[PDB]
Amino acid sequence: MNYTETVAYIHSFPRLAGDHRRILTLLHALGNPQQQGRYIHVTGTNGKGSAANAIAHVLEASGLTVGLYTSPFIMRFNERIMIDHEPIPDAALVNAVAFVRAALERLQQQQADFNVTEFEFITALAYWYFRQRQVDVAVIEVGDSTNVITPVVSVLTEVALDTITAIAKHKAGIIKRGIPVVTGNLVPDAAAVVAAKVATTGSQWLRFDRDFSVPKAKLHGWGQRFTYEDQDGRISDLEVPLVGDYQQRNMAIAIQTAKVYAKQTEWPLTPQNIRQGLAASHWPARLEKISDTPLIVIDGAHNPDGINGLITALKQLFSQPITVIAGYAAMADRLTAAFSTVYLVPVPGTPRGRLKDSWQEALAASLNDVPDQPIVITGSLYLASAVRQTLLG
């Protein structure tokens, strides 16, 4: 096939019904690449994509070839599988999809009704591609079809209040015997689930605000300047180009995890690597300022927690009036009460306050009416990625 037939073939996979048998059957046909190499396992309800990207950036700056498996993509499909922050080239995706389909067709010649899902096909391809390219470590963000590895260190960023013990027990399945777990400051029910699991596995548990912390943090331009502290000391005046107070805990989790990786593998990691790797830690479409003149910021906050955390982040950055373009009525009532011009438009991959029929009509209106006013586009990551693909791709 071509690339276009290859990405359409990946999306043609079904919606099957538990354990990891189907993906392990497929992975045995690929020669078990999940059993070789080093891995960092990342799960959590929020902040896992941001942490994983930060861990990868810090490890790459120390001189390691880092594979990175994330979801979702923002600009193109190829962003889900990266090696040193470069998305898997089209032709390499064409080759890899052809190799995995060939092994899958061999498996269907034996077991006639064998199949896998879309995420299981992608995860198996990701794990085979990282071994083919021979990376030093692969940072794996949890989708659990990825739970077929023994990591060097596991990360559990958050189990947020949105049942808690039932969610925490599903998330604690990535914690393995003797392998250290780096977590955030978990809520009581999630913490009790983590404490009992690590007493069972015998794991070293490094927790945010206990073993490591951020004693100083403040805004500095479009990003934050902060100080990290642990048992080895402090690394002061670290800078990341990400706004939001919740990002202080994701970066701190990322720094602690990277240090736990290097100590376990006897790899040298300096504070310089951590500093340089945190400076390169850009995470697209998450309060990203994409244009200076005119001022345009894109964001994918989609819950009311995301709307409330955005509102105070926008208040921190802007003391002038802005136009906010929003992709239900409780999310829109807090936007109208806090901001100037507010436009409600439709999100592009969905179906059926000032109303606009599209985000382009709202953006053209604001630029025509008041050209010096900043525009923030928020409400969905799919709407935010549509604006980013249009305005930059």
* Smallest separation (angstroms) from Mg ion to the CB of 189: 24
Reply yes or no: is the peptide bond before residue 294 cis, omega within 30 of 0: yes
* Smallest separation (angstroms) from Mg ion to the CB of 63: 26
**Pair type for strands 354-355 and 341-344:** parallel
Contact between 155 and 40 under an 8 Å Cβ cutoff? The reply is: yes
Contact segment (CB under 5 A) with Mg ion among 46-54, 158-166, 297-305, 337-345 equals 46-54
Contact between 260 and 203 under an 8 Å Cβ cutoff? The reply is: no
Q: Which is nearer to Mg ion, 107 or 182 (CB)?
A: 182
* Smallest separation (angstroms) from Mg ion to the CB of 100: 23
Contact between 191 and 158 under an 8 Å Cβ cutoff? The reply is: no
* Smallest separation (angstroms) from Mg ion to the CB of 70: 5
Number of Cβ atoms within 10 Å of the Cβ of 170:
13
Report DSSP state, residue 112: T
Contact segment (CB under 5 A) with Mg ion among 44-52, 190-198, 306-314, 343-351 equals 44-52
Gap between the Cα atoms of 58 and 227, Å rounded: 16
* Smallest separation (angstroms) from Mg ion to the CB of 316: 24
Contact between 309 and 315 under an 8 Å Cβ cutoff? The reply is: no
Gap between the Cα atoms of 134 and 139, Å rounded: 13
- Residue ranges for the known binding site are 47-50, 71, 73, 80, 141, 250, 286, 299-302, 385
Q: Which is nearer to Mg ion, 120 or 335 (CB)?
A: 120
Number of residues that bind Mg ion (CB under 5 A): 1
Contact segment (CB under 5 A) with Mg ion among 43-51, 145-153, 241-249, 347-355 equals 43-51
Q: Which residue is nearest to Mg ion (CB)?
A: 49
Q: Which is nearer to Mg ion, 49 or 223 (CB)?
A: 49
- Residue ranges for the known binding site for ATP are 47-50, 250, 286, 299-302
Identify the bridge partners of residue 141 per DSSP, sorted by sequence position: 42
Contact segment (CB under 5 A) with Mg ion among 47-55, 74-82, 224-232, 270-278 equals 47-55
Residues 142-201 that bind Mg ion (CB under 5 A): none
Contact between 159 and 181 under an 8 Å Cβ cutoff? The reply is: no
Q: Which is nearer to Mg ion, 62 or 70 (CB)?
A: 70
Contact between 194 and 156 under an 8 Å Cβ cutoff? The reply is: yes
Gap between the Cα atoms of 11 and 376, Å rounded: 32
Q: Which is nearer to Mg ion, 53 or 224 (CB)?
A: 53
Contact segment (CB under 5 A) with Mg ion among 45-53, 128-136, 248-256, 344-352 equals 45-53
- By CB under 5 A, is residue 44 in contact with Mg ion? no
What are the tokens at 55? 């861990």
**Phi/psi at 228 (5° precision):** -105, 145
Q: Which 3 state secondary structure label does DSSP give 138?
A: strand
* Smallest separation (angstroms) from Mg ion to the CB of 141: 6
* Smallest separation (angstroms) from Mg ion to the CB of 53: 9
Q: Which is nearer to Mg ion, 157 or 341 (CB)?
A: 157
Q: Which is nearer to Mg ion, 49 or 180 (CB)?
A: 49
What are the tokens at 270? 């300096």
Identify the bridge partners of residue 377 per DSSP, sorted by sequence position: 298, 325
Q: Please identify which residue in 33, 47, 49, 151 interacts with Mg ion, judged by CB under 5 A.
A: 49
Residues that bind Mg ion (CB under 5 A): 49
